Design a binder for these strands. Sequence first.
DNA 1: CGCTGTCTGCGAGGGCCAGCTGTTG
Lengths: 108, 605, 15
Amino acid sequence: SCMDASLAIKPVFERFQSVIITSGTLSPLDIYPKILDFHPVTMATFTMTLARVCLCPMIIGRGNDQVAISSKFETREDIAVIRNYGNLLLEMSAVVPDGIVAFFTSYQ
Amino acid sequence: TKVDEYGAKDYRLQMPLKDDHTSRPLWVAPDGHIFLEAFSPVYKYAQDFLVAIAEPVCRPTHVHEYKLTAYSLYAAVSVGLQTSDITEYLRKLSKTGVPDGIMQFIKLCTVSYGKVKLVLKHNRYFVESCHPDVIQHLLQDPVIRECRLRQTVSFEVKQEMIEELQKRCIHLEYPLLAEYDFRNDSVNPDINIDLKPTAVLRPYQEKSLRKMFGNGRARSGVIVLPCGAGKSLVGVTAACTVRKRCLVLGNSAVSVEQWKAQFKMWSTIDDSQICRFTSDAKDKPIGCSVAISTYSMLGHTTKRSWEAERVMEWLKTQEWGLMILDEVHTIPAKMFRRVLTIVQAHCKLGLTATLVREDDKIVDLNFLIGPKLYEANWMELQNNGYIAKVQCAEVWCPMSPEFYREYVAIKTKKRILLYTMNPNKFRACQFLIKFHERRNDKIIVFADNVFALKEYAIRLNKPYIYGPTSQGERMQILQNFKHNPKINTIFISKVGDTSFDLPEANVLIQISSHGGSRRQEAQRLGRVLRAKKGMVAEEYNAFFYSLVSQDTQEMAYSTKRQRFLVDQGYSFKVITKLAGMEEEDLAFSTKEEQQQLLQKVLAAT
Amino acid sequence: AKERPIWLRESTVQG
DNA sequence: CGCTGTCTGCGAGGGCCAGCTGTTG
Ligand SMILES: Nc1ncnc2c1ncn2[C@@H]1O[C@H](COP(=O)(O)OP(=O)(O)O)[C@@H](O)[C@H]1O
Ligand code: BEF
Ligand SMILES: [Mg+2]
């Protein structure tokens, strides 16, 4: 396994005058020049502007028991944390219309 | 001190009225009495501040009342408040302002905390303080010098005279801060006690511990919560935080067993560590990280048996980081208070529900254990569903004419048996048990008079518990009553008024009592105050009945013993008559039966 | 659904 | 003939009520 991606992508930057790494859901741009050895011209972040606020994000760190719900490696074994996720999904499934997806951390 | 024409303490020349009084919900009279409004938008914030500085006197559902006492204030500074913070917030809450007398009074009882500290180390008690001047002032006091063992300055003081030292320290306006720095105490080994994740403490439980552990050090004091609120869990949690050897002092053999079970249920401590020290048996108290006992066993004054003496020798020669004292209100007794000095403990945590006594010794808990750290509001918890809703009642049972003929004439203390053994009262108890059993309710019946307890137990053919019954036998009845559907009603005596955990006991009845013991009444109602499984907040899940004999001295005691409960908002509806009694085949339906009963009562003497 | 008895539900005072 | 469990007295104590002095207007 390699350790830095700049090595294999180096020819792209030199051969081609300019490369635009367009992406969505991008974690902050300043890291990429550190990960990939290049000097970006601009670091622009765009937020969609719509008449209606389509996306409604939220974070649920506390359940009905007001207990920490972090899926920490040491706290993963907690029954309450496991119960809280089932409670959230069960309750949410009641209100959420057809179509829903849940993402875990690992298969195990 | 001006008195109106209607014997009213006129306080209009004393304090003014604030312009924005509608938002401000607090009154503050120069007497110290504080009348808070429960319907104000800012009630929640005011109550927590007020309950800390002032111990509640009465808390009906609408307008609460508190009183300011030196001991009440001394608790405020210990938790973390300061004179500037209390008075400023009090003035902010006051809709009439704080009179100059109270304003100076609050200041007076706040410049006394922190001057002197009491530290126990290496089985030695020392009077620690960072100011030599206050120590020198104490030395001038005669008794303080008398109890002495025969920058920061500390002089050792003999263990046997800790009580006298503490009592005089308050009298000298220099309370001893018996505060334990458990987190910075590696001398005592840390125990493997840990709070299992399955155990979650309710907001009032956590709030009480927050006052106890406001700073890194652990505070020693009396924590008051309603019966059935879960004081066992709070006591267990205190041990978990300390992580040191813990001594738990129950009230009887039933108390320790429930303490043992609660530790196992609410803590990861292994069964081997948990031990008991009771006349029934002992789980090797010599080797144990958590010791459970009773005031009677430790407080026993006569020479102890060899089996108990060996354990007692170990207990005295030990260092305890946390000594949980269940049923604190019994501590100020003449001998039970000695148990504090006999055992060496750094932080003394006190758990109780009825911080009331018919004597004036209840105030001694301020220095015997510490300030009242917390006091939950019964109605607040009742509405939250943490404790079952109880519809208290007082069934008025008319006195039998044959009995009353004797009761009025007889005055040689034989009245108690006469109106305790009232046939009319018996029928009401007999009918009530029958009706409530048909409703799948778990009945509990109490009776101070064992004679009455036995008379009713056999006549109704229901199990009864009292002194002579062996620990195993009484323990068996509770387990049957807890689980066995056949045993739906049990009879108990003064033994089981406290520490008996019967979560499913919906109904309670009382046919006798020991005078006007508010502690007995509030404790007795506690058994059925535990939260029920299918409990609903506003459905009156549980019920309490205090059978009384009309036109009898029991009426005076019935009103006397209801003082504490009504102070917490409980309303004792009066039941002059019970419907459906006539159509019921109840006992003592003939004068011959009643005539026979009266003769037996007279014979008992 | 296990309603309260008459005496507890409503006042028993003659007045 | 020994050992363990049951039951019954000795001694003490808690909680509360009521009483004959001690004290104050
Ligand atoms: N946080 C809790 N979660 C679940 N049950 C609880 C909790 N706290 C207390 N309980 C239950 O309430 C009862 C408390 O009994 P106990 O500790 O003897 O009360 P107290 O000492 O206040 O009289 C028990 O049935 C106990 O299991
Ligand atoms: F207040 Be509980 F019954 F110990
Ligand atoms: Mg308890």
